[PDB]
Each structure stands twice: as structure tokens, then as C-alpha cells.
């Protein structure tokens, strides 16, 4: 990172608590996780926190971080790090509206979007709550019109297809949440998500819809995002093309089929959308933290207002828990500190999100943005080069598919991979014995990762079956041995209700906040996506049939030239 | 890994070529990638290989591995490692049928499934080709009956829904390939994939289908996989439940709606499926290498026989290329050596699969199994503990969604992430200018990762706009700086045809082979999934309402107890 050419940050590495954690790593890092359970019979309880979601169904968010290389000394020391880095003060600063996003000088108030208490939160001396509530009401009114069949298309047909056009922050949330809350959805409304600028994405959606009965939701923060605008222009062209082919008058069609979710009012007006059909969100709403805002319109159209309010309330309950609960019983802080322990001391650069809920299959992809785009920084707020590892690579697939895909590596690979196992006690689908069979894997995999299977256990088991062959035993022994001591966090909820999902995302948003603040980075900007955009914009006019270039490096030149030789 | 309790492997670390590569890393590892381009104006060509797919459309698989910290000395040295570890001999051994899967004493012949030359390949002194071709013909006959509408359901309805029931190796391939080859599919046949034992997966598919017009394909190697059998039992129960509710005679219904893809003949017969409806595959066909076999039936039903043969031929062309092409011009070997260079010398434990093709959106998940389940081993074939890092964590999303998700981390994170950018020159969907806009990002992102943007370039650019503020420049400078020197491989094809997909998967299968052989591990077994299965089987009878347990660690105990307290 000497190529960044800024001086190295010492504020974190010079912390008394950081030096202590390094000492505790050298001392207790080689101690297997099972040792902590053998020495403390109450570890499961002492290293777990249950947070009630405040609902009638007695739903909760239970974090069990016991399956970790963390003893009482390390835990106390991680909490000391949180105190020395001023997390409590930073949390208050984020929540009260301060310009914590220092590089862009913007507040970070995604918590305001779900502020059900309607406690005044000020930006420029003005309470943002009436504006947040105004959009939520506008979203309610509009979503009800789409859901009841009141909102008609140009030919008078009720909406049957809801196509969200947006990428990243204006896609992953809408996709993840509608997928996660499908049993709470209105089934007669087919949700489609056009995000990729690959023509295929719009083309396949156009093949799956009855355009006359389709509401296109153009979602984009700046409303300038090349992907979203190109797709939206093609979606508009498609609408106009259909009506022209049928000989129908196209006047006023766009206003009935197109709505916008943006911060930018003028680019929405330039596109041809009515102002009353523009759902406002603000600059203090980060894209990867926007599913709670206007961006959440396709979620609200799918699940309804009441369920969207539950989604917000779950987030609010965790926001209140995060800001008010004591350090040792604070779920997102503990989740963050467990992460810092593994990333910075163990050197674990990856983190697996393994949701044992098929509805949560798009959660790892969502968390990839939430974590990686937030914390994949190498410079602090002060402009200094980080002297520690920052954001990890997030990956994962909904279990149990991951088991038959990459658990082999988590169990027997050369990499230590901290895992987050998320599961529901009650399924929304009461299908035979599926849920108990499903959940047997949930508890087993974490147990497996922790306890492992020593050579002695393997030898015994083989001697237990009909194995008389010392050759077969000796040969199979190391292959069947599981070192164990592989960490995992278990997130257990009563059921995946909209409130529960809200609670889970907020927890991760807040985990990311703490980790970012410990590292001293700006978890809310994204300067890293700019070079790719600028270089793409420079390559775009060069992608013409037979055009030859030489202004780039020989690889990019040869690639563009080859493309141009065989493109059209 | 002292907990494996086997002696450390020295066969790889003692290699003259390994010691040399470590020396070359210490010497040239800090040299930025751009330096290699500045010193060699022909780097783009010299560090790239075009492999023709032998088709009329002049399709190819082009690997550009130039954007790497590899100079001529390092390349020569990586090829020397390949020669010292006996890769050429190992490849011949794999291809000719030898028991290279040493821990299970099984051949590894997924190459036989796509052996279009029909060159005799022997297992137990018997040519496997007539058996491979017999199943391919049986698959052809059956798939044509489903496609033409000849295969009827119990009520006489033509098949409209094809539901594949299988997990991992019996899922990811079928999902990835049908998604990848959707423009070559028969649209009136809706493909569904039930994999998760989460009741939700079967339940949602049951809501999306007309059971009378549904063919259920039970795919499982051993036909004992708990997930696949539980789902298949529920799919059968669902069929029988429908007919009983309509008062229809259920006799002979299962035989018309259910088919099996297995190696196990008796478990298929015990389930209630006719023998003529059992599509055979063998023990030498690894699950994660099975999409080419009987497991590929849902792919064949979707795209047709001719297109499935093209899929096989693409794989065959790369199989021939891999086994016969010279080391310096061998695509999977080079791809593998670039990987070994990054994993073992740079310490890069992650690898991003970034396919710039929306149809290839399930490719990273497929490659997660192919790579991670194959190479996520810590013990060699000889039973010794590995002394090097093995399989990396594979992740990725189809671009351009990844750009707005985690590229921020790849560009500005504290982790070096080797990336595989895969793209097509020609789209199957000619939608406006979408493909050129799309591909501008494809070439740009790799260029971006490589060249970066130095502080001088950032200062100049800001001075170029209307920036007079030295404070704003100085503050934004490190945040806007891109260190560059981030590696990438560019895989460019003319178009994503079935042949092209076959070529891509085979290349990765062979990359995994070389990497596994260099490390000395068994890339074809999966002993790491067994503990989770055994512990799940032990937890299953304990998951009853109100049941309390104490035989596990306090975490697993508390989790099972909490589940049982609030489950039913």
C-alpha cells in the first residue's frame, strides 16, 4: 500500500487494547475452541445473547458466538478495543445525524428510514422524519393501488408484473427481501429484476411479461448509473414498440407504466416520468443501506405496507438494541468484534454467510455489497493508509446446498473461514419432516466445524465397523480426520417474518459500522468503483466494428481489437 | 494442521522448482504488473492463447493471463514446476483410466463422458465408451419424447414442467447449464430445481407447477443423499396427493412422472421407478464433474440432444487441447499455474469468477463446488499433511452486478484477489447498444485492476477539473488512489454457445486437476462432508417438541434445546 503514498495509520495499532489483543492471540490463538467448552460448562449461555423483536409472536434474534477462539480475557479485551476506539460515541454520532461519512461530508442515516419512534433526527437543523414518513405514505398509497388492481396500464389492464430496474444498492435489497419474504407476498404480482446492462437481463424479462400489465420501477440514486438508464431506456423503448406494433396511441403510456426511485429530481423529469410518481430518498441513504427507503418500493408492492412496516420495525428494534444495550450484551458489536478478532489477528480474509433458509438465498449476495463495498477500503477517514486488514471477502450459499458445494473446504481446507449460520426455528412451509431434517444439518455443521474428529476417534470408529485392515485404517485416517476448531456464529430466529429480516439486515449493517469504525475507515463511501467507470467510458466509443486501438496496455488493446474484429 | 497428526509433506516444498519460485517471488513479487507491459510491448500476445473450438462459427476460448505478476523467468519456472510434479504424466493417467482417485481407488473419467472421438478408454479391461454412448442415446430418446410432447403424464397431459430433484453435483451443473444455455432452450418446458431439504424449495416448486404436466427427475449418485430422497419422497407424495384429491386412480402414475439419474440400481427400484427410466452413470464420474453424464438429462431436455452433444464436444476439444497442447500454450495448465503462483506465493486465498454474461450467473456457484470441494483438502494422496495452501475460496457474481457490489474491495481492499473475467464477443440478445456498453466494463475493469491510478494522476485530474482547493485535493487524494497491480485473467469467447460452455467448464475442471496434482492432493474425493452428515444424523432424532439434550457441547445443546422449546 506504499502506492497509495499516504503515511501509515498508527492510531489503531498503537491502541493499548490492540497490543493486548495481539498478545492474547499469541497466547490463546492456538487453543482449540473445544477447550473453552471443556473449561466453561456455561459457555453456550455466557457467549450468547437473545434479543426480543418486541412482537406478539415472541420472535427474537439469537446470536451464539460461543464457537470461537475467544476466552473471557479475549472477550474483555475486544470490548476494551471497542471502548478505546470510541464505538459508543461513533454510534451516537451516526444515529444523531453527524457527518460521519467524512470523505463526502454526508450524514449516515439509514436508521432514520426505519425510525418508528419518530424521534427527531436532524440534518441541517431540520427533522428528517416528516420527509421519511411522507415517502412511506406515498409508497403505501401507490403500492395499494398496484396490489388492489386500481393502477391500470395504458390499455386498462391491472398490473400483473412489477419490473424493478436498478443495479447494486437499487437491486440486491429488492431482490433479497422479496425472495426472503415470498410467503408474505401477493402471489399474483410477479416480481422481475433487471440489473445487468447485459441485454440478456432486459430481454429475458421482456419475454416473461405482459407489458400491458407491467409496472417498470426505475431505481437509481443519482439516476445517471449507465446500467439502470440503458435498461430503463430499453424498457421504455419496449413499451413504445409494443403500442406502435398494435397501432395504439402511446401518449401518456410512460406515466402509467413507469415510476422512479431517486434522489435526483431533474434526471427523473428528463426521462419522462411524472413528479407524483417519483419516490424520494436522500444523499444520507447509502445505496447498500437503501432497501428501507423508496428503493424498497418493489418490496412493499410485493409484501404490502403492513409487512414493510414490520420490516422497518425489525430494523428499528435492532437499531435501539445496538445504540442502547450494554457492550457485553450488544449483538452487532459482539458480531463485529468476533469478526475483527478473526480478520486482524487470525488473518482470516474470508467470511461465509450460510443462511439455512431457502428464502434467504440472495442474502449472501446482499451482504457482499453491504460488507465488501462498505469495508473494502485501504485508507482511513484521516487520509492515512490502513496498517491492518480491513473488509473480508464475503461468500456463501443458502444451506443445505453449500454443504454439497464448498463445506469440504471449510472443514478440510487450508483456510480458516469464520461462518455465520442463520436459521429459523419455525418454517413458513410445513412440509412433512423437512424442517427437522433441515435443521439437523444447521446445528450439526457448526458442531462439526467446532469439535472435528481426531485421529483416535476415526481409528475407533473404523475398529467399530468391520475393519480388520490396519492398512485401510492407516491410509484413510488422515483423510477422515477433521482438525475442528473452525469458528462459526449461529444466528437463530423463531421464524423469518418481515420483522426478523429487518432485524438481521440491521444487525449486519451495524456490524459493518463497528468494524469500519474500529479500522478507522469510511464504511459509507465508494471511491473504488470510479476508475472502472471512467475507463469503461473511455473504452465505449472504441467498441465499433473493425476499430483498432493502441492507447491502452497490450492486453486491453489486443482484447478490444479482437472484440472489434468479430463483434458485428 | 498438527491436529491431523500425520507427518508434513516435503515432496512439493523440496522441489527445485518450488524453491526457485519462492526466490523469484522474493525478487519479482513487488514489481507492479504494469512494469511487465512497459518492458514487453508484446506481452498481450505472448501471455495469451487462443484455442479454436473446431466449430463452423469459428468459436474459440481465448485466455489472456497477461495481467499478472509473471515475467518470463516466473513463467518458465511455473512450467518447470508442472514438469517436476509430473503433470503431463498425471493427465495421461487420468485420461487413460488409472485409479488417480487414490483414497477411493477409483478412476477419474469425466472426460470419457464427452469423448466424441470414441477412442477406447478402459476401466477393469472394458471399454467404457459403448456404455457412455448407450446412456447418451437413452437420454436422446427420452428427452425427445418430453420435448415433442410424446411423454404424457398420468392424465394424458404433455410435459410442461421439468423438475430436477438433486443437490450439489446433481444440481449446480443442471442449474448452471440450463441458465447458461437458455437461448438454446425449448421455452415451453419450464425447468425447476429442487435441491435444498428446506421444505420451502419443494413447496415453492409445487406452487409453480401443474403436477399433471410435470416430470420429476430424481438425481443422486448414491441415491441415498438425505436431501434428494426427502424431496423426492415429498414430490411423490405430492403427485399421489393430487390424484387422490381429484379421486383419480394412482396406479402407474409414478412411472410416468418420475425418472432417475443414479449409479445405484437397487435404491432406484426401491423408490418405485421403472428400470428403463433409470439413466446410468458411474463411480468414476465425480458429482461435481457429472453434468456431462446422465445427470445432464434436465440440460438435454431443455436444450435438446444436438445442443447437448455440442456441450460435450466443447469439453472434448478442451480435453484434447489439455492432453496434447505444449506446456507454454496449454490453457488449463497456464490458468492453474497462474493460480498456484497467487495462492502459494502471494498468499491469495480467494479467487473471483466474474462472468460477464447474465446467462452465466450460476457459474460462480458451480465453480465453487468444482474448485472448493475438489481442492479444499489438507492431506495428500500419500496420507501426509500438506505443507502449502491448497484450494482457494471461490466467489463472484455475474458482471456488471458485481461492480456495484464488491469491486470496491477488489480495487481498494487490503486483499489481493485473482479474478477470472469471462465474456462473450457476441451476445445472443441483440438489444440496442447493450452489449458494447456491457463489454466496455469487461475490458475496463481488468485494465483498471491492472493500471490503477497513482496519486499524481489523481492530482492532475482534479487540477484538470475546476479544483483550486489544495485541501480538497489533499483530502480526496488517497481515497481516489488505486494502487493497481491487481491481477486478472480474461477469458474471451466469440459467443456463449453450448460448445463454448462445455469448453469453459472443461478448462476449469482441468485447471482444478493440475492445481490438485501440484499440491499432491486427491481432487476427486470428498471426505470433508462426512462429519456433518454423521452429526446431523445423530441430531435428527433429538429434534422433537420439548426434548432436552446434554450429549453435545453447551452451544449445540442450548441451540437444540431452544429449537425444541419453540418448534411445534
Curated annotation (Swiss-Prot), chains A, B:
Gene Ontology molecular-function annotations: carbohydrate derivative binding; glucose-6-phosphate isomerase activity; monosaccharide binding
InterPro entries, A to Z: G6P_Isomerase, G6P_Isomerase_C, Phosphoglucose_isomerase_CS, SIS_dom_sf, SIS_PGI_1, SIS_PGI_2
Locations listed in the record: Glycosome
Assigned keywords, A-Z: Gluconeogenesis, Glycolysis, Glycosome, Isomerase, Peroxisome
Residue ranges annotated as motif Microbody targeting signal: 567-568
Enzyme class: isomerase
Metabolic or biological pathway: Carbohydrate degradation; glycolysis; D-glyceraldehyde 3-phosphate and glycerone phosphate from D-glucose: step 2/4
Alphabetical GO biological process terms: gluconeogenesis; glucose 6-phosphate metabolic process; glycolytic process
Annotated catalytic residues: 373, 404, 533
Pfam families with a match to the protein in the record: PGI (PF00342)
Main location: other
HAMAP family: G6P_isomerase (MF_00473)
Family to which the UniProt record says this protein belongs: Belongs to the GPI family.
Subunit comment: Homodimer.
Protein's name according to its UniProt entry: Glucose-6-phosphate isomerase, glycosomal
Organism: Trypanosoma brucei brucei
Gene that produces this protein: PGI
